[PDB]
C-alpha cells in the first residue's frame, strides 16, 4: 500500500470498470473532491510509491457527495447543489464533457444529493430533500420522483433487484421502494430498536439480493436480510466513529471493506455473513477516510488528509 | 424448501416442470390449472395464476419447448385436450394470464395422457384416451397457433369392455434427437411401442412383455451418451421395469428387460427421470420415492429411499 | 440411505388405505418434486436429490480439479525423448497428484470453516488421507527404491501418518505432564508417549518431551553416564537425515554405537530408567521388537519400520504384516484398510466406495490412476461414450460432467463441457451428439453466457442448436433486436404498416458507429427504402422520385397499396403515367378499416385519382 | 467420417464415389490400348514440331496427354486405395453387372509405361522447341 | 561474422492476452512442424459448441475470428523462428568447423596470426556472454574452439590483454558450473580451460595480485559451486567424471600456494571426503583405458590433501585403513 498526496480533500475514489473478458487488474480510477472554492472530478491511471498520471480533471461545483462509474467512459456525480451530472470521459483527447444532467434533482431552494446508484441505463438519486429518483440515460426529466419519500434525511441508497431499491436514513431506518409503486410509502422498514442511529452507507451484496450491509454514526457494521424480519442478521462493534462506506468484495464478497472518519479502513475477512478476521490497512496517523473502492486485489481511498491510498497486491 | 398447499379442493393429478426447472404446471380434479414460480430471491415457490380449465377432472398436464413460446397443454375426462399460451401483459393470479389457443374433441371418450413432442420435431403432441385411439397433433405453420390439424390416428386396444372403471394409459415419447422418430405407449396390461416409418406412418415397432397387471407410469428416458434406449415402467403389480431398446415380427428394434425391483411392496404409481437419464425415480403404495442410477455393468442400483 | 422427505409435515401415517405417491425429477438436482394423488391430500412437497452439494465451497473444489485435469495436458493420458518421457511422465502426474491432494485440503478446510454440517469434513479428511498414502507409495519413486529421492519419499510418509489421525493431540501431552504416584516423569506414560512421538518421525516434540523434566535433573546429577547417552542421543536425533541415504547409513551407526556402549556400562540410575533408556536406543537403532513393542497403531509401526530399521520398500509387504500382527486394522475409521490395501499392492476396487464418499474426487482418483497406467481400458469391441467401452476413468468423468448439468450452476457448466471435449477417447461426432443436447439446457442469463453458448455452438459446429437457443430468445425492441422466414417477412408487413402510418434503429438501418459496425434482410432493405421515402417527403423532384420508389415498392409486394393511393390522392412524366397504371392493374377487412381511418367506395376514389393523372399528363 | 462423424453424411460421399466417373477413368487408363496410344501420339518426327506453329493442334495434344499422365501418376494411389475396394464391396453387396477393361498385371500405371524405352528420349528431344509449358 | 544477434530477439516472442482459445494447445499439431488444420479443426468444434450453448452467439463471433486470424500468423511466426534458429545453428557449427580446420592445419608462424587470434576472442567474448546459459547448442561448438585455442599458445601489450579476456573468460566458465547448465559434455569442456588457466597462467608482484584475485571468484559463489563439481565425479559419463576429479585438484594445488584451506574443508562439509573414500574399495575391479586414467585422478587427490596439517584430520577420521583392506589389492 502507498499514498499519494493530491492537494484536495477526496470524498469519493472509484475505480473504472474492466473491459469485459479482461485478464488485467484495475489500473485507473475517478475521484471527486470537496471542500474546496473549486472542486474537481479526475481521472488517474496507475503505471507499471507509485506512479500516478493525472489524465483529465473537470471542475464540479458544490461538493462531490458520491460518485459512480455507469459505464467504462460515464461518470455519474451528486452535488451538494442537487445536481446529478453525468461526465463523459473520451479517451482519445483525453477530456471530460458534461454528457447530461439534471439540475433539479433535489431542492427544497438548493439540497444536497447524498447517493447515486447507477445500473446503466438507470441511475437512482436520493437527497436532503427526503426525494428518491429514478433517471434513465437520455431522458431529461426523471422517470419516477418518488417526493418526499421519507421525512429524515436520506443518507445512501441500493438496488436489490431493479426496479426495487433500499434507502437508509438518519433515524436507522432502512425503507424499501419500488418505482411502479403508489403513493409515498415504503413497502418495509426494518430498523435496530432503542437508539435511532443515522446510518450513512450501504450496499448489496453481489449474489445475495436481499442481503444488505450498512454502516452506522456509531461506526458499527449491520448486516440485514430483508426476508428474515425488522432487525438485522448481525450487529458488529467496529470504528470509533462514523462509518462512510462499505462494500462488499465484487468477486469474493466473504470479504467485506469499511472505512471511517476515524481515520481507519477495515479489511473484513468472513472466508459468510449470515451465520471474522479484521486488519486495519491504513497508518495510525490517518485523519477521516471518506470513501473506498475495490475491485479484485485493487484498493483505492480517499482522505481528509488530500491523499489517496492505493494497493494492487491486496491479496500476495 | 417447505411443503405448500396447492389450492386445489379435489384431489390433484400430475404436476409437471418447464424447460428450465423454475415452474411448474399443476392439474386436478376440480378442473383448475396452476402454475407456480420459482422466486429468485427468496427461493419460494409461489402461485403465478390459476384458473379453471375444463369441465370435467383434468388428469394430464405437460410444457411445449421454449423455442416455440411458453405453452402448456391440458387432457381431462371430458373427452378434450386444450392448448395456451401464457400472456405475459397479465397480472399474476388474474386468472387471466393463459389464453385458450384451441381446442381437440377428435377424442369419444375420456384422455388419460398428453405428451409434447421432442421439440426437433416441431409442435407436435400425442393423446390416448378411453377410446383406445392413440392422437398425433401438428402445429404445421408454428405461427398460427391455432392451427391444430391432426396428423395420425393409432388403434392400440381394440376391444375396451364396456364395463372397467380400471382403465389407465400412459404416453412417453422418445427425446432422442438422434433417433428415429418413435414413442411408448401403455394400455392395461400391455405396453407397445411405435416407431415412424419411411412411409410417416406408425407401426408397432416391440412390445415390453412381463406385465402382469395395469401399468401405471412409463417414460422414456434421455438417452445423451448411450447409443440404446431405456424405458422404465411402474406396475400395479408391485414392480418397477426398466428395458433396454436397442436397434440393430418386422423389428428393427430389440427388447433386453435390464432390471426389475420389487422394493416398494405395493403399486408403483410414478416414474420419472433425470435430465440426463442418470437418475430414474419411483414412487408407490409404501410412501418412499427411491433413486436408482446404472452400475458399470448396467444393472440398476438403489442409490437412496426418500419418504 | 434413508432420508426425511420432509422433517416437518409427513404426508402418510398408518396403512390406511395406501396412497398412490407420484414423484418428478426436476431440470435441477436441488429442485424436485413429491405429490400425493388422493382426498385431502393436496401439498406439494419440493424434494432435492439425497447428499447433493450446493455450497461454493464444492464448486471452487470442482474448479480447482478441472484445472489440475486441463494443465495436465497430454499427460492425462498413459503411452503404454526416450527414456526421458518415461520419468518425466511419472514426474508431472506425481505432481498432479499433489495438487488433487492439495485442493482436497483446502476445500476441506473451507468445510470445517463454514459448515452446518461437519460430517462432510471428516469425510473428506478421511479421502485425503488415502491420498496421501497412495502418493506416498506409487506417487514418488515410480517404482524404485528410497535411495532414488529419500527426501521427497520421508516428506510425503510423515505427512501421510501425521494427517491420518490427530494424536497424539496435546490435549494428551499435559495429560501426563499433570498426572501422582510415582518420582517425576518415569512411569510406561511418557516413554509410551516419547518413543511413539519417534516412530512418528515427531523428533521436534520428541526431543521437547525430554528438555521438559530431567535431561539435566536427576540424570547430570544422579549418573553422569548415562546422562552423557540421553544427551548426544537427543544429538543424533537433532541431525536425523532426510536427504542423503548415506548420511543415514552412518546415522543408524553412530546409533548402534551409542547403544552397544550404553549397552553395556555404568549403571548408575534405577532399575527401571535403564531398560527405559535402552528401550529408546533400541526403537532408535531400529531393533524390529520393540519398534513393534511401542506401537499403538499399525501405521505406526510400518513407518517406524522405514525410518530406523531399514529404509527399502522392498521390505513393506514383511512390514505391514508384522504391524499387522501387532495391532489389527481399526474399522472405526474408513482410511485404514484402504490404506492397508494400498501398501499391500491392490490398489483398485477402491472407485466405487469413492464414488460413494464424493463423486467428484472419485471421478478425478479414476483419471489420475488412468494417466499412472494403473488401471487401463481392457475392452475391444455402439457409436458412443456413456459406456464401458472406454476406460473406467472415462466413464466416472463423463459421468460427473452429466450429473453437473443437472446442478444448475452456469459456473461448472464449463467445467462439464470441457470434461466431456478433452475425453481421451470417443469420436469428435459423437462428442458432438452429446454436446449437441446437452447446452439447450445451460442456465444462461447474462449476454456473456448467450455468447458463451454460441461460442460453444461455433467450436462444436451446432448451428441446428444455435438456431434453436437464437429461437428461444427471440421468444417492438425485441423484434427490432431480432432483426424463421414466416418471421421476417411478418416483420417487414409490420415495418411497412409503421410507415404507411407516419428513430435511432430506423437511421443505422439507412455508441452509433457500433451499432452501424454490428449491422453490417430483406425486409430491412424495405424498411430502409420507406424511410429515405419519408426523408424526402420530409425535405418537387424529389417528390416524384419518393412516389416511383412507393410505386416500385407497391410492384414487389393490400394495405400497402391503399396506403399509397392515399399518397398519391393527397400530392393531387411518362413513367409516372405508366406506375400509375400498373398500380390500376394489381388493384380486405383490415384494409377497408385503414381506408376508413384515412378518410377520417375506395377503389372508386382510386379510378378518380387515376383519371385525373391522365388529364393532368394530356394537358402537360 | 465413419471413425468419428456420424453415419449420416456416409451415404452422401458414398453416391459420390460411386456414380463419379473417375473410378472409370482409372480402370481404363490400366489398359495397354490407352497407353499405346498416348506413347504414339507423343512419338513424332522434329521436322513436324519444328516447322509447327505454338498454337498448333499437336503441341496442345502432346500438353494435355503429359498433363493427363500427371493427374494419372498423382492420383493412382489415392484411386487404389479409396476406390478399388469399395466398389467391389458395393458390387458384391448390390447387383451390378460391369466389364473390366483394366490388367490385374498393371499393379501400377508404370508397368505399363516401363516397356517404351523412346519415351525419354523424345521427352528430351522436345526440350530443343522454345515452348515454355511443354518444356 | 555478423549473423550472430540477439537484438532481434528470435527466441522471444510478444504473447498477445488471448482472453478465449488460451485453453487450446498445441499439442496434436507437431522436425518441429505444428500443423495449422490440427488446431484450426479444433477452434471449428469449439466454435460449434459456443454456438449450441446460445450464449451471445452473434457478438463474440469476432472475437474468436480476430483469435483465429492471430493464432494462424502466430503459428507461421514460430515456424520460421525455428527455420531461422536451426539455419543459424548450422552456420555457426559450419563456421567453427571451419576455424578449427584453419587452426589445427596451419604452419605458418603464430606471433603474426596473434592479432587475428585476438580478434577472433574478442568476437565471441560476447557471443559467449550472451549465451553463457541460454541454449546449450551454440555454446558447444564455441566451447571446444576456445578449449584447443588455450592449449596451441609490444609483447607486453598484448601479454596484457590476453591475460586479461583469460580472467574473463575464467569467469563465465565458474558461472556455469554453479548453476549445472547445459549437458554434462558441455561441462567437461569448462574444467579443461579453468584447469591449464590455474595451473599455466597463475603458476612476482604480478602473480600475487592475479592469484589473490582469482581466489576472491572462486569463493564468490562457495559451496553451490563446488557442490556440482562433487556430483559430476563417479557418475554416468566417463570423461566428465575425470575432468571434474582432476580439476579438484588444481583449485586444491593453488589454494595452498596463496595452515589451512577453506577449499579442502568445504569438500568435508558436502559429503565429498567421505564418499570418495568409500569409492576406495573394490578398487582392483576398476583398475590409455578410460577406467584406468580415471583412478590416476582419484588417487592422485587423495595425496595431496594428506600433505597439508588439516587433512589428516578430516581424512583419518574417515578410517580408511579399513577400506583399503577389503579390496585385497595388497
Given at each position: 500500500?502507498y499514498?499519494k ?16 473478458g479482461?485478464?488485467?487488474?484495475a489500473?485507473?480510477?475517478?475521484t ?22 493525472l489524465?483529465?480533471?473537470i ?10 462509474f ?6 455519474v ?14 479517451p ?10 439534471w439540475?433539479?434533482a433535489?431542492?427544497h ?22 426525494r ?6 437520455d ?5 419516477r ?5 421519507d421525512?429524515s ?12 431499491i ?20 415504503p ?8 437508539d435511532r ?11 445475495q ?5 450498512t ?14 424480519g ?10 470509533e ?6 462494500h462488499?468484495?465484487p ?27 479484521i ?16 475491485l ?21 | ?7 386445489h ?5 400430475d404436476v409437471?416442470?418447464?424447460?428450465y426447472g423454475?415452474h ?25 395464476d390459476?384458473?379453471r380449465?375444463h369441465?370435467?377432472?383434468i388428469?394430464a ?7 416455440y413460446?411458453?405453452?402448456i397443454?391440458?387432457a ?12 405475459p ?8 394470464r ?31 384416451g ?60 400391455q405396453?407397445?411401442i ?11 415397432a ?33 414392480r ?13 428394434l430389440q427388447?433386453?428387460l435390464?432390471?426389475?425391483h420389487?422394493d416398494?411392496?405395493?403399486?408403483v ?17 409404501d ?9 458399470y455393468?448396467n ?7 426418500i419418504? | 440411505?434413508l ?9 402418510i ?7 398412490p405417491?407420484?414423484f418428478?425429477?426436476g ?11 388422493a ?7 419440493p ?7 450446493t ?5 471452487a ?32 502426474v506425481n ?6 491432494l ?17 460430517n462432510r469434513?471428516y469425510?473428506?479428511e ?16 515410480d517404482?524404485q ?14 505427512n ?5 489421525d ?5 490435549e494428551?501431552?499435559?495429560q ?35 528438555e ?8 547430570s546429577?544422579?549418573?553422569a ?5 540421553v ?6 536425533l ?12 552412518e ?8 547403544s552397544?556402549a550404553?549397552g553395556?556400562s ?7 530408567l ?16 520393540k ?8 501405521y505406526?509401526?510400518f513407518?517406524?519400520f ?36 494400498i ?27 488412468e ?6 481400458n481392457?475392452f475391444?469391441?455402439?457409436e ?17 460432467a ?17 470434461l ?14 452429446v ?7 445451460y ?8 455468447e ?21 430468445l427471440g421468444?417492438?425492441?425485441?423484434i ?33 458507429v ?11 432493405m424495405?424498411q ?7 426523408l424526402s ?12 420508389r ?15 393511393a ?24 383490415l ?9 377520417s ?5 382510386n ?14 | ?9 456416409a ?16 480402370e481404363?487408363?490400366?489398359?495397354e ?41 498423382e ?6 486405395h479409396?476406390?478399388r ?10 447387383g451390378?453387372?460391369?466389364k ?5 498385371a498393371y ?7 516401363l ?11 522436345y ?9 | 561474422?555478423?549473423?550472430?544477434n540477439?537484438?532481434y530477439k ?8 488471448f ?8 499439442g ?12 484450426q479443426?479444433?477452434?471449428a ?5 459456443y ?21 494462424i500468423?502466430?503459428?507461421?511466426v ?5 527455420l ?16 578449427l580446420v ?5 604452419d ?14 574478442q568476437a ?6 550472451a549465451?553463457?546459459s541460454?541454449?546449450?547448442d551454440?555454446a558447444?561448438?564455441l ?5 584447443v ?24 566458465c ?6 549445472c ?13 579453468c ?9 612476482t ?15 564468490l ?6 557442490n ?12 566428465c567424471?575425470?575432468?571434474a ?6 583449485l ?13 574443508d ?18 582392483l575391479?576398476?583398475w ?27 581424512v583419518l577420521?574417515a ?12
Open positions: 500500500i499514498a498526496f493530491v492537494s484536495q480533500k477526496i470524498s469519493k475514489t472509484r475505480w473504472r470498470p474492466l473491459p469485459p479482461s485478464l488485467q487488474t489500473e485507473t480510477f475517478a471527486g473532491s470537496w471542500d474546496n472554492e473549486e472542486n474537481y472530478i479526475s481521472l488517474w491511471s496507475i503505471g507499471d510509491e507509485g506512479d500516478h498520471q489524465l483529465c480533471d471542475r464540479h461545483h458544490g461538493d462531490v457527495m458520491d460518485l459512480q455507469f459505464d467504462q467512459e460515464r461518470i456525480a451528486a452535488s451538494s447543489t442537487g445536481c446529478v451530472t453525468v461526465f463523459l470521459h473520451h482519445n483527447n483525453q477530456t471530460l464533457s458534461v454528457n447530461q444532467q439540475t433539479t433535489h431542492y431552494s438548493s439540497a444536497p444529493c447524498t447517493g447515486v446508484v447507477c445500473n446503466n441505463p438507470e441511475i437512482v438519486t436520493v437527497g436532503e430533500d427526503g428518491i429518483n429514478l433517471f434513465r440515460a431522458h431529461k426529466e426523471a422517470v420522483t418518488i417526493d418526499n419519500a421525512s434525511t436520506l443518507h445512501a441508497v441500493t438496488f436489490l433487484r431493479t426496479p426495487e433500499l434507502t437508509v436514513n438518519s433515524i436507522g431506518q432502512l425503507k424499501i421502494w419500488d418505482f411502479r409503486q403508489q403513493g409515498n410509502e413497502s418495509q422498514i426494518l430498523s435496530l430498536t432503542g442511529v443515522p446510518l450513512h452507507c450501504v450496499d448489496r451484496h453481489p449474489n439480493q436481499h442481503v444488505v450491509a454502516g452506522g454514526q456509531d461506526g458499527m457494521l449491520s448486516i440485514w436480510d430483508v426476508r428474515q425488522t432487525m438485522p442478521v448481525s450487529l458488529l462493534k467496529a470504528h466513529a462514523e462509518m462512510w462506506e462499505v462488499f468484495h468477486s469474493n464478497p466473504e470479504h467485506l471493506f469499511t472505512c471511517s472518519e476515524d481515520g481507519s479502513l477495515w479489511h473484513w475477512d468472513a472466508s459468510s455473513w449470515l451465520s471474522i478476521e486488519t486495519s490497512l491504513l497508518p495510525s496517523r490517518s485523519l477521516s477516510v471518506n470513501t473506498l473502492d475495490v479484485g486485489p485493487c484498493l483505492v481511498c480517499g482522505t481528509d488528509a488530500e491523499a489517496i491510498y492505493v494497493t494492487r497486491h491486496l491479496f500476495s | 424448501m417447505q411443503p405448500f398447499d396447492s389450492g379442493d379435489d384431489l390433484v393429478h409437471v416442470y418447464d424447460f423454475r411448474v404446471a399443476t392439474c386436478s380434479s376440480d378442473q383448475h390449472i396452476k402454475v407456480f414460480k420459482l422466486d429468485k430471491d427468496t427461493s419460494n415457490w409461489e402461485l403465478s390459476s384458473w380449465a369441465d370435467s377432472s388428469v398436464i405437460d410444457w411445449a419447448s421454449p423455442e413460446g411458453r405453452i397443454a391440458s381431462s375426462y371430458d373427452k378434450t385436450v386444450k392448448l395456451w399460451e401464457e400472456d401483459d397479465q397480472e399474476e393470479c388474474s386468472g387471466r393463459w389464453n385458450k389457443l384451441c381446442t381437440l374433441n377428435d377424442s369419444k371418450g375420456s384422455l388419460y395422457s398428453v405428451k409434447f413432442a421432442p421439440a426437433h420435431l416441431g409442435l407436435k403432441l400425442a393423446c390416448l378411453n377410446d383406445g385411439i392413440l392422437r398425433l397433433y401438428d402445429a404445421l405453420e408454428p405461427s398460427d397457433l391455432r392451427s391444430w390439424t391432426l396428423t395420425s390416428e393409432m388403434k392400440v386396444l381394440s376391444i375396451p369392455p364396456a364395463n372397467h372403471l380400471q382403465s389407465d394409459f400412459c404416453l412417453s415419447w422418445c427425446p432422442s434427437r438422434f433417433s428415429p422418430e418413435k414413442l411408448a405407449v401403455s394400455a392395461l396390461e405396453a407397445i411405435y416407431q415412424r416409418g419411411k412411409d410417416g406412418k406408425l407401426h408397432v416391440a412390445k415390453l412383455p412381463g406385465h402382469k397387471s395395469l401399468i401405471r407410469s412409463i417414460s422414456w428416458a434421455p438417452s445423451i451418451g448411450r447409443w440404446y434406449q431405456l424405458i422404465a415402467t411402474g406396475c400395479k403389480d408391485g418397477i421395469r426398466i428395458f433396454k431398446i436397442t436397434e440393430k415380427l418386422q423389428s428393427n427388447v433386453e435390464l432390471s426389475e420389487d416398494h411392496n405395493g403399486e404409481w410414478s416414474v420419472s427421470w433425470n435430465l440426463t437419464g442418470t437418475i430414474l425415480s419411483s414412487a408407490g403404495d410412501g418412499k420415492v427411491r433413486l436408482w442410477k446404472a452400475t455393468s444393472e440398476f442400483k438403489c442409490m437412496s429411499v419418504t | 440411505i432420508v426425511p422427505m420432509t422433517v416437518n409435515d409427513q404426508p401415517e398408518k396403512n390406511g388405505d395406501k396412497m405417491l407420484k418428478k425429477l431440470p435441477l438436482s436441488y429442485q424436485n418434486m413429491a405429490f400425493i394423488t382426498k385431502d391430500k393436496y401439498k406439494l412437497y424434494v432435492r436429490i439425497p447428499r447433493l452439494d455450497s461454493k465451497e464444492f464448486s473444489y470442482v474448479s480447482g480439479l478441472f484445472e489440475i485435469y486441463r494443465d495436465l495436458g497430454d499427460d492425462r493420458v498413459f503411452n503404454v525423448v526416450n527414456s526421458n518421457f518415461a520419468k518425466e511422465h511419472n514426474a508431472t505432481l498432479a497428484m499433489e495438487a488433487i492439495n485442493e482436497l485440503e483446502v476445500f476441506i478446510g473451507r468445510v470445517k470453516d463454514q459448515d452446518g454440517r461437519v469434513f469425510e473428506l478421511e479421502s485425503l488421507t488415502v491420498l496421501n498414502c497412495l502418493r506416498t507409495m506409487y506417487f514418488i519413486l517404482g527404491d528410497v535411495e532414488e529421492n529419500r527426501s521427497e519419499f520421508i516428506e510425503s510418509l510423515l501421510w501418518i501425521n494427517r491420518s490427530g494424536e497424539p493431540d496435546e494428551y501431552i499435559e501426563v505432564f499433570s498426572v501422582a504416584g510415582k518420582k517425576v516423569f518415569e512411569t510406561q506414560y511418557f516413554w509410551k508417549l516419547l518413543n511413539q512421538l519417534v516412530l512418528r518421525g515427531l523428533l521436534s516434540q520428541a526431543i521437547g518431551c525430554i521438559r523434566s530431567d535431561l539435566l535433573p536427576y540424570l546429577d544422579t549418573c553416564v548415562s546422562f552423557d547417552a544427551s548426544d542421543s537427543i544429538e543424533l537433532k541431525q536425523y537425515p532426510k536427504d542423503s541415504s548415506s548420511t543415514f547409513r546415522w543408524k551407526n553412530l546409533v548402534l554405537k551409542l552397544q550404553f553395556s555404568a549403571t548408575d540410575i534405577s532399575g527401571e535403564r531398560d527405559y533408556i535402552e528401550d529408546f536406543l533400541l526403537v532408535i537403532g531400529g531393533n524390529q521388537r519398534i513393534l513393542q511401542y506401537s499403538r497403531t499399525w505406526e509401526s513407518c517406524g522405514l525410518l530406523y530399521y531399514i529404509p527399502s520398500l522392498e521390505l513393506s509387504a514383511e512390514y505391514l504384516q508384522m504391524s499387522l500382527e501387532a495391532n489389527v486394522v481399526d474399522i472405526t475409521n474408513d482410511w485404514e484398510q484402504p490404506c492397508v490395501d501398501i499391500s499392492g491392490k490398489i483398485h476396487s477402491i472407485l466405487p466406495v469413492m464414488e460413494s464418499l464424493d463423486s467428484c474426487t472419485a471421478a478425478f482418483t479414476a483419471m489420475i490412476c494417466a499412472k497406467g494403473l488401471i487401463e481392457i475391444e469391441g455402439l458412443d461414450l456413456f459406456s464401458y467401452r472406454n476406460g473406467m476413468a472415462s466413464y466416472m468423468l463423463n459421468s460427473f452429466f450429473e453437473l448439468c443437472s446442478l444448475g450452476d452456469k459456473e461448472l457448466w464449463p467445467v462439464a463441457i470441457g466431456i471435449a478433452l475425453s481421451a477417447t470417443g469420436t469428435r461426432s459423437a462428442k458432438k451428439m454436446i449437441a443436447e446437452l447446452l439447450p439446457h442456465p444462461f442469463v447474462t449476454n456473456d453466457d448467450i458463451w453458448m454460441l461460442s460453444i455452438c461455433v467450436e462444436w459446429r451446432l448451428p441446428e442448436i444455435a438456431k434453436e437457443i437464437y429461437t428461444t421468444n417492438i425492441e425485441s427490432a433486436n431480432f432483426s424463421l422466414v414466416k418471421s421476417y417477412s411478418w416483420l417487414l408487413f409490420e415495418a411497412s404498416c409503421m410507415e404507411g402510418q407516419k428513430v435511432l434503429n430506423a437511421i443505422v438501418s439507412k455508441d452509433d457500433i451499432i452501424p459496425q454490428d449491422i453490417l434482410v430483406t425486409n430491412s424495405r430502409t427504402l420507406a424511410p429515405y421515402a419519408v417527403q420530409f425535405y418537387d423532384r424529389e417528390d416524384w422520385g419518393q412516389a416511383l412507393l410505386l416500385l415498392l407497391l410492384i414487389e409486394f393490400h394495405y400497402l397499396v391503399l396506403l399509397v392515399k399518397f398519391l390522392y393527397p400530392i393531387f412524366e411518362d413513367s409516372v403515367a405508366t406506375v400509375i397504371e400498373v398500380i390500376e392493374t394489381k388493384w380486405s377487412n384494409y377497408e378499416t385503414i381506408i376508413e381511418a384515412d378518410k367506395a375506395t377503389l372508386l376514389k379510378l378518380r385519382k387515376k383519371l385525373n393523372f391522365k388529364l393532368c399528363q394530356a394537358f402537360m | 467420417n465413419i471413425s468419428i462423424d456420424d453415419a449420416m453424411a451415404t452422401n460421399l458414398a453416391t459420390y464415389v460411386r456414380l463419379h466417373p473417375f473410378s472409370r477413368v482409372m481404363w487408363l490400366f489398359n490400348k490407352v497407353i499405346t496410344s498416348l506413347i504414339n501420339t507423343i512419338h513424332q518426327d522434329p521436322i513436324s514440331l519444328g516447322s509447327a506453329s505454338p498454337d498448333s493442334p499437336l503441341v496442345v495434344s502432346i500438353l494435355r496427354a503429359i498433363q493427363v499422365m500427371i493427374k494419372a501418376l492420383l493412382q494411389e489415392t484411386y487404389l479409396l476406390v475396394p469399395e466398389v467391389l464391396r458395393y458390387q458384391g453387396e448390390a451390378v453387372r460391369r473390366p477393361v483394366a490388367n490385374a499393379s501400377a500405371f508404370e508397368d505399363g509405361i516397356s517404351h524405352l523412346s519415351l525419354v528420349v523424345d521427352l528430351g528431344k526440350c530443343n522447341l522454345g515452348h515454355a509449358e511443354l518444356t | 561474422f555478423d549473423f550472430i540477439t537484438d528470435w527466441e522471444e516472442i510478444p504473447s498477445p492476452h482472453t478465449y482459445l488460451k485453453d487450446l494447445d498445441l496434436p499439431c507437431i522436425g518441429v512442424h505444428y500443423d495449422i488444420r490440427k488446431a479443426e479444433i477452434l468444434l469449439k466454435r460449434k459448441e454456438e449450441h450453448s446460445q450464449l451471445a452467439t452473434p457478438e463474440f463471433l469476432e472475437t474468436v475470428e480476430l483469435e483465429e486470424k492471430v493464432l500468423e502466430w503459428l507461421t514460430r515456424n520460421r523462428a525455428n531461422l534458429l536451426t539455419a543459424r545453428l548450422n552456420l555457426l557449427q559450419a563456421w567453427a568447423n571451419l576455424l584453419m587452426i589445427e592445419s596451419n605458418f608462424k603464430s606471433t603474426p596470426k596473434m592479432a587475428f587470434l585476438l580478434q577472433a576472442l565471441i567474448l560476447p557471443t559467449l556472454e549465451f553463457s541460454l541454449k546449450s551454440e558447444f561448438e566451447a571446444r574452439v576456445a578449449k585455442l588455450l592449449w596451441k599458445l609490444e609483447q607486453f601489450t598484448v601479454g596484457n590483454l590476453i591475460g586479461d579476456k583469460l580472467f574473463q573468460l575464467f569467469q563465465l565458474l558461472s556455469a558450473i554453479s548453476q547448465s547445459g549437458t554434462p559434455e558441455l561441462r567437461s569442456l569448462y574444467y579443461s580451460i584447469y591449464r588457466y590455474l595451473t599455466a597462467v597463475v603458476d608482484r604480478s602473480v600475487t595480485n592475479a592469484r589473490a584475485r582469482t581466489l576472491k571468484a572462486i569463493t559463489y562457495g559451496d553451490r559451486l563446488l556440482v563439481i562433487c556430483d559430476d565425479a563417479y557418475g554416468s559419463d566417463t570423461t567424471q575425470t575432468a576429479m582432476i580439476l579438484l585438484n588444481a586444491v594445488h593453488t589454494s595452498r600456494a596463496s595452515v589451512d584451506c577453506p577449499i579442502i568445504a569438500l568435508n562439509r558436502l559429503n565429498f571426503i567421505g564418499v570418495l573414500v568409500d569409492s576406495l574399495k573394490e578398487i575391479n576398476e590409455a583405458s578410460p577406467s584406468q586414467q580415471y583412478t590416476s585422478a582419484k588417487l592422485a587427490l587423495l595425496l595431496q590433501l594428506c600433505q597439508t596439517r588439516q587433512g589428516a584430520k578430516y577420521q578410517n580408511l585403513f579399513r577400506a583399503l583392506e577389503q579390496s585385497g589389492v595388497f
